[PDB]
Design a protein around this nucleic acid. Structure first.
Ligand SMILES: Nc1ncnc2c1ncn2[C@@H]1O[C@H](COP(=O)(O)OP(=O)(O)NP(=O)(O)O)[C@@H](O)[C@H]1O
Ligand SMILES: Nc1ncnc2c1ncn2[C@@H]1O[C@H](COP(=O)(O)OP(=O)(O)NP(=O)(O)O)[C@@H](O)[C@H]1O
Ligand SMILES: Nc1ncnc2c1ncn2[C@@H]1O[C@H](COP(=O)(O)OP(=O)(O)NP(=O)(O)O)[C@@H](O)[C@H]1O
Ligand SMILES: [Ca+2]
Ligand SMILES: [Ca+2]
Ligand SMILES: [Ca+2]
Lengths: 311, 311, 311
DNA sequence: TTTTTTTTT
DNA sequence: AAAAAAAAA
């Protein structure tokens, strides 16, 4: 992806390109994927130059109708990240794919942050061993990152211990406003270095307590829908796979599984791949594909041990 | 439909016909179906020639009162596209008809993009096997097109794999402004080649996040009403059937089904055929006719398997 | 942690800093960890100064992306409090850690307030003998504190009897509203003196009787989720370890351990370390790790005698 | 015109 | 084996 230093080849002053770096449009695709309405709200941008900054941006990126046999060629280089086990790769037909949003949920001991700890090491492998190249990013909301679990998986694949821990960016969000502000700093780091998985663990922990009651429900869902839109804008800009962790609630009053995830119909439509984790005989757990555009509905089996997620 | 090259037979200069191709009036019916007020806003068109360009256009197309026994004859050649199953053709009395707008909605795993993947292959069949002739068009908003599902339905009907994928145009919209701009390029492609289904998956995903709050509600609905007007103008120009995908919201505060679609009273009046999809025992799902000018209210049953939508 | 007396170095009037001490933001980290939405609800705070009070607070605390090899360095100084026995330290790999929430539950004679009486004396030891330095805090809901059990454990470690009892703050909650109000006075005492364990015995005794029935379930869980959020805000501000005591209920209607704790899915996701206590041959009891981000699932053995919890 | 939450015994 | 309530933009 090209930076916005290519935009002095219209004739824009250099000061206006400094303004766009304040607004988070660090990449030239972020200008072309943005509407005209949102570009006006930057202080110092008029109607005339915002007409010029959008049409000149549509020079450099291809936006228009193409053939589906050319888009089928472009899906052939999609990287799929392995999860550590052969049984989960039998479900996802190669693992978690890049350029998309994947959501995992379940109650309370089903290993949601254990997969996210295993995936931060398999995303640094060479592509011949599974997974892609690059570093990783971890956005944490409840305060469970523990780095002693990352070193145990590098013990399994034989990687260096210090090279694994130094190539992981960590940031902790303390409220819903700080959670959105960490995405603007995330887009400013991806243009220097090649990345992989952006992990938002868990995304919906802070939305349950900052907005409470029926009276503050509509203000909650508009903030969550804007947050899931920026995660979608990050996945197509840099080719980053996104992993989202959710929670569940019970249904006291239904009639005849009773645990459905939170977020309503906004997070249900925004996420495209959804996995449902539940516990069996706890040595092992059970993964089940809940919603996917391509994969059929099936199940698999887990293993959580000292070397990450296994068979 | 006749192109606008027939309009030098008034005495217009050739330069003014070049101007109308900038404004999207590629077909001679698009001039006659347009008001005088909208033709003035093209740079270089005066009051005198716009009076001449409209009345000369009303020479070539029939606009006026006719007998209903002649319009009943003209409904006899309406093509109806099959959906793949015999159970849904029992509802729609032959399938999805051409020259109209059809809307499907439901929550989150009810197979809305699975019907739209099945319909992009049955619209290329010969007319003796069901469906019509021509290519297909897919406008995508959330990024789920996957072409590996298109090849699995060509495995069912025995068509060639490469001939199916090469005859589908694909374009991805990134905001609401780009979604309207893809319709002007759509009207410039239909005059060379015979087409079929224009699929706008989903139409109302981007309108939830670009315009938020009660203060920006009135600016949202005026853009959506102009977008549904251009889809209606495409259906009568070329005889193209339009399939629209919608989403749902919940009603926290009503009293006694609770999921009603989004778009308000604008998309409810503009769309004329509406199908409500819900899930039963998930192997199968349930379709229900919600609103139609001719079809009675009834239900049917689904099947989603490896070969598309089945029985 | 810095007090909010450092906030006259923006240019705020001294009266607005007096207002924040009414709202419980006694520490400068409590301003930076708070959202903008919650700061507006203080009487006398406008939109302009609340924008200034948050960005100036983000000067003094580090909030942003860092390297995981630097966060791994910061976990090396985490204090772990001993529980009195060597067998429980073999489970927790050093004992109860600081900066987190630990939950213990079991039925009715499993020694839940006997561990909490033992931990109020081992948290005053020098760090060479196990545990950390500082005083202790006990929030009681059912009225069982008895101080004659605290003197018996100081008999074991050889500490002074009067110095142990004088360094423990005690407060009894009488309803759920008074239980939340004791946390605002708790944050105003930690900035003068160095502390340790905040013990909320038991947290969920009063929530069973003040809110009863299915009709008052949703109002119960929103109050409990706000209470567990303030306990999490206390643990990262001052580095205080939090110990929570829970109760159990039976499941009349399940099919094949039958005793699951109360609080639903809110207290299950908020607490990160959970211990399950049950009784064997009562001289001894059995501890079992139920849910932890790092520790594996195993068991241990207890001893309750005259000198606290032993081997 | 928009926006679902919440397990007891 | 059988249970119910909740609101603001
Ligand atoms: N080193 C380890 N060896 C084996 N099992 C472990 C180890 N560390 C953790 N576990 C188990 O892994 C699970 C932890 O799952 P985890 O995702 O961290 O919690 P969770 O599902 O997120 N619930 P919560 O974080 O409270 O919302 C528990 O079953 C632990 O017993
Ligand atoms: N190859 C397949 N075989 C069987 N079932 C499949 C297959 N591919 C997808 N499915 C199922 O079909 C459904 C997909 O529905 P789909 O319409 O694509 O999502 P959706 O209803 O649009 N929700 P969303 O796209 O997020 O708004 C899911 O139930 C999948 O499990
Ligand atoms: N043959 C039929 N038998 C029974 N019900 C029918 C039949 N044809 C249509 N309907 C029902 O009649 C209703 C449609 O009535 P209609 O007058 O078209 O409402 P409408 O307001 O005009 N729709 P719209 O034009 O978008 O505003 C729907 O509920 C259909 O299910
Ligand atoms: Ca977790
Ligand atoms: Ca869809
Ligand atoms: Ca009508």
């Amino acid at each position: 992806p090209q930076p916005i230093s290519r935009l002095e080849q219209c004739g824009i002053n250099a000061n206006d390109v400094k303004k766009l770096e304040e607004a988070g449009f660090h990449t030239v695709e972020a200008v072309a994927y943005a509407p005209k309405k949102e570009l006006i709200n930057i202080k110092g941008i008029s109607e005339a130059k915002a007409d010029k900054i959008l049409a000149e941006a549509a020079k450099l990126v291809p936006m228009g109708f193409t053939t589906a046999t050319e888009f089928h060629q472009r899906r052939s280089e999609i990287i799929q990240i392995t999860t550590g086990s052969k049984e989960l790769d039998k479900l996802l037909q190669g693992g978690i794919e890049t350029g998309s949003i994947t959501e995992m949920f379940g109650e309370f001991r089903t290993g949601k942050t254990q997969i996210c700890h295993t995936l931060a090491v398999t995303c640094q492998l060479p592509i011949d061993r599974g997974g892609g190249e690059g570093k990783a990013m971890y956005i944490d909301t409840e305060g469970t990152f523990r780095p002693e679990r990352l070193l145990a998986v590098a013990e399994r694949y034989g990687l260096s211990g210090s090279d694994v821990l130094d190539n992981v960016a960590y940031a902790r969000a303390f409220n819903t406003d700080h959670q959105t502000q960490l995405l603007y700093q995330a887009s400013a780091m991806m243009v220097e270095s090649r990345y992989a998985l952006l992990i938002v663990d868990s995304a919906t922990a802070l939305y349950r307590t900052d907005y409470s009651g029926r009276g503050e429900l509509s203000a909650r869902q508009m903030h969550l829908a804007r947050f899931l839109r920026m995660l979608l804008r990050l996945a197509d800009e840099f080719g980053v796979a996104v992993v989202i962790t959710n929670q569940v609630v019970a249904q006291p009053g239904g009639a005849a599984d009773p645990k459905k995830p939170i977020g309503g119909n906004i997070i249900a439509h925004a996420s495209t791949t959804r996995l449902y984790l539940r516990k069996g005989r706890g040595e092992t757990r059970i993964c089940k594909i809940y919603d996917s555009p391509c994969l059929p509905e099936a199940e698999a089996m887990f293993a959580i041990n000292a070397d990450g997620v296994g068979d």
